[PDB]
Amino acid sequence: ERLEREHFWKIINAFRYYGTSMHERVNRTERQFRSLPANQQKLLPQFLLHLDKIRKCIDHNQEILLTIVNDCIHMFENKEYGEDGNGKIMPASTFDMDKLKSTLKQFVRDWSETGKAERDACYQPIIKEILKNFPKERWDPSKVNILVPGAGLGRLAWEIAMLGYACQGNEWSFFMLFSSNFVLNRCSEINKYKLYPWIHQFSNNRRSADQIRPIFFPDVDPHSLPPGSNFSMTAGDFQEIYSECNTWDCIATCFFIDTAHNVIDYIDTIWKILKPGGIWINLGPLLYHFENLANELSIELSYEDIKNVVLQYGFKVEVEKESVLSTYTVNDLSMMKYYYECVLFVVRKPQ
Amino acid sequence: RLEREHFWKIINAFRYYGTSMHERVNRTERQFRSLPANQQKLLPQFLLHLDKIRKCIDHNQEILLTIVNDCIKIMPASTFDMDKLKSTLKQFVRDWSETGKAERDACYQPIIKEILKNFPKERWDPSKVNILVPGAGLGRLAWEIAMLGYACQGNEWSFFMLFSSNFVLNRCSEINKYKLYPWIHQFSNNRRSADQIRPIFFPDVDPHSLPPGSNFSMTAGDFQEIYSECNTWDCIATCFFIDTAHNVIDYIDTIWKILKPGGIWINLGPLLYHFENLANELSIELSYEDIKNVVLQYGFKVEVEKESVLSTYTVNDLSMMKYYYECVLFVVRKPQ
Ligand SMILES: C[S@@+](CC[C@H](N)C(=O)[O-])C[C@H]1O[C@@H](n2cnc3c(N)ncnc32)[C@H](O)[C@@H]1O
Ligand SMILES: C[S@@+](CC[C@H](N)C(=O)[O-])C[C@H]1O[C@@H](n2cnc3c(N)ncnc32)[C@H](O)[C@@H]1O
Ligand SMILES: [Ca+2]
Ligand SMILES: [Ca+2]
């Protein structure tokens, strides 16, 4: 696990490098603008001032990321990771800078009022299926064990625990784990924090102000879980952490199964660790994460093939809805938006 | 000259399509065969389906070869050029297939309606109205404009597009004679395995059905270099085009220059700046608000402005993931 230590400080270092990276991007824009003919520059007399506002938004974002860094460096479970790693002050990769940008957007989806419409489209259908299958009239929710793999910043798992179910989120990415630890443990005052999740988008802006607008978080107090709640989060590969068979009443995957190198392996795990009679609720598209990465296994299945594999495992299909429309960390003011026609299904492991 | 080097570079890319795509399928096949036998047995049609993909690749390569030959050793083309090739196949859906009609109706019909409103027969002899369509892609919009009787010229920079528009516009008459498989490179977000290999047919109309006395033409080259004669055009119609500029202010300058006094510029599209993420390329990314302020300072008069014109671009209607654009539509007039 010396390589996990190496990976830990690599991610810490990426968090610390955000401002350097983004300030370079803005300096390229200023350089290019300053090389235009003077008369064209005079057509845009607020352009340089707007770059200054972007730079302030960058500094603010960097301040949020250093707060997360400060939080996770001083966590007891992270003492096994060491002093400061190498004596390396190293630049971070662009691949990690892209993950940082996505992580900032994830705050919108999971912990901002701005993301409520997205959560209503993705999380509420899952929560409703849970209420349908484990209704309060017949089930003590505190004895129903629900696992949420790839929980991201944890809002879905948290919402399930708010209803009283014994809910565990699981997440492999340090970007998400550092950030959700910060939100779930430290952000105990509604909308106290702010970030600028769209400053990286220079294209498709209707108004220049849209790029620098803030989002506030958290929209709920994460510590309003009532007494008797049972909420937890685990760190690691879903496929390695969960080895006990016949354990879970429910597994809820939301925009997750297409993260697999091999989705058949996910299906195999979910079958093994569900209790007889347990259910797997899935909602999401099929954007295979490793498809366009060299030296990475990626088995890309159509939804039709996924359902055929699920049926051959012995699962029984109880709910299937195609074309469940949603966005994912959408920028509502952008002139370009991605939409997903997700499939929702509920399948049961036979008793 | 180095333009003939660039020419043969694109010819070679057309000829490398099958090689590049068969290698992609090889990686999927190798990875599937790497799986444990018990997992491969769950999917007894998987390898046969790759074989259908390979047939569709071969059929696409035949089409590309008739395009290249009806335009007149194989070296590895760049990943950058194969992506442009894949996009060109998709462009056939948008411009010359019935599949693309809903897209054309959302993007092309608003432009044509503004042309009809601004050059009505009660005022204009249409055959003397000169309309320019920069970045005409495969030519459908410019062709529709010429079908109304106006003197319309399309202009296109990309050899991928020019080779293909030449094939469609000059060697196609029989409706739906040809088919392509524009979706075979999409392995993600498929509802049904059959959706990846489904065909589209083109052309949905006969391009040689232009009326008598028509005036339709296409030029090859950089819009900003080819059009130097001032005060020439009655109308310039830009559709998903102005975000292709290194510096959109230069496009605005050219449009101002070559419009006649009283002529109009019709624009519809988003602002996805082509060079934003390309290393060592100039890219001035303006908000729409800033583009409007440049247009106002040039002296254009704003006659029409609609934001949030909703459209897709070479959408795969069966895909589980789709891109939507909230386009701006405007019509501005160079004062008389
Ligand atoms: C597209 S995000 C979805 C996040 C969240 N479920 C939501 O809908 O907002 C998928 C998440 O799964 C995580 N992930 C991918 N593979 C994983 C694995 N093998 N084990 C645990 N988490 C994984 C990624 O880090 C990412 O946070
Ligand atoms: C996004 S496509 C739009 C095609 C077509 N107008 C449509 O709406 O379907 C933009 C087109 O402009 C072309 N283009 C980019 N820069 C150009 C230039 N400077 N001169 C001429 N064409 C250009 C590209 O090759 C491409 O075909
Ligand atoms: Ca300054
Ligand atoms: Ca509190």
Total domain count for chain A? Answer: 1
Run of H or E residues at A339: strand A336-348
Beta strands in chain B (DSSP E): 130-133, 151-156, 178-180, 200-202, 215-220, 233-239, 259-269, 301-311, 321-333
Handedness of CA A16, A20, A25, A26 (dihedral sign): positive
Run of H or E residues at A280: strand A274-284
Please give the number of the atom of ligand 1 that sits closest to the Cα of A110.
9
CA of A207 to the centre of ligand 1 (A): 33
Cβ–Cβ of A299/B193 closer than 8 Å?
no
- Nearest one of B242, B259, B245, B270 to B298, comparing CA atoms: B259
d(C-alpha A61, C-alpha A195), whole Å: 6
Domain that holds residue B273: 2-333
Q: Which residues of B touch A213 (CB under 8 A)?
A: none
Please give the number of the atom of ligand 1 that sits closest to the Cα of A266.
19
Evaluate whether B57 touches B22 at the Cβ level (below 8 Å).
yes
β-sheet bridge partners, residue B267: B238, B330
**Residue of the CA atom closest to atom 24 of ligand 2:** B135
Task: For residue A68, report the phi and psi dihedrals to the nearest 5 degrees.
Answer: -65, -45
- Nearest one of B118, B172, B174 to B145, comparing CA atoms: B118
Expt. technique:
X-ray
Contacts of the segment A46-52: beta carbons below 8 A, 24+ positions apart: A46/A208, A47/B290, A50/A208, A50/A212, A51/A26
**Residue of the CA atom closest to atom 9 of ligand 1:** A152
Name the residue facing B31 among A297, A335, A337 (closest C-beta): A297
Evaluate whether A183 touches A155 at the Cβ level (below 8 Å).
no
d(C-alpha A83, C-alpha A73), whole Å: 10
Q: What is the CATH number of the domain that holds A318?
A: 3.40.50.150
Neighbours of A241 (CB within 10 A): 17
Got the DSSP string for A137-164? TT--GGG-EEEEET-TTSHHHHHHHHTT
Name the residue facing B187 among A205, A300, A312 (closest C-beta): A300
Q: Which two tokens stand for residue A216?
A: 């506030």
What CA–CA distances, in Å, run from B212 to A29, B124, B131? 51, 18, 18
For ligand 1, residues with CB inside 6 Å are A 109, 122, 149-152, 170-173, 176, 237-239, 254-256, 259
Angle A255-A256-A260 from CA coordinates, rounded to 5°: 140
Cβ–Cβ of A308/B190 closer than 8 Å?
no
CA of A227 to the centre of ligand 4 (A): 14
Residue A138 in marked binding region: no
What letter represents residue B122's amino acid?
A: E
Numbers of helices and strands, H then E, in chain A = 11, 9
Q: Which residues of B touch A337 (CB under 8 A)?
A: 323-326
Contacts of the segment B167-172: beta carbons below 8 A, 24+ positions apart: B167/B66, B167/B67, B167/B70, B167/B71, B168/B92, B168/B95, B168/B96, B168/B138, B168/B139, B168/B202, B168/B203, B168/B207, B169/B139, B169/B143, B169/B207, B169/B218, B170/B207, B171/B70, B172/B96, B172/B202, B172/B203, B172/B206, B172/B207
CA of A48 to the centre of ligand 3 (A): 6
For an interface test with A, give the residue of B23, B251, B320, B327 to mutate (most A CBs within 10 A).
Answer: B320
For an interface test with B, give the residue of A202, A212, A283, A313 to mutate (most B CBs within 10 A).
Answer: A202
> How do the residues of chain A divide into helix, strand and coil, expressed in percent and rounded to 5?
50, 20, 30
What letter represents residue B238's amino acid?
A: T
- From the CA of A178, which ligand is nearest? 1
- 3-state secondary structure at position A252: strand
Neighbours of A79 (CB within 10 A): 9
For residue B27, what are the contacts with CB-CB under 8 A and spacing of at least 6?
A: none
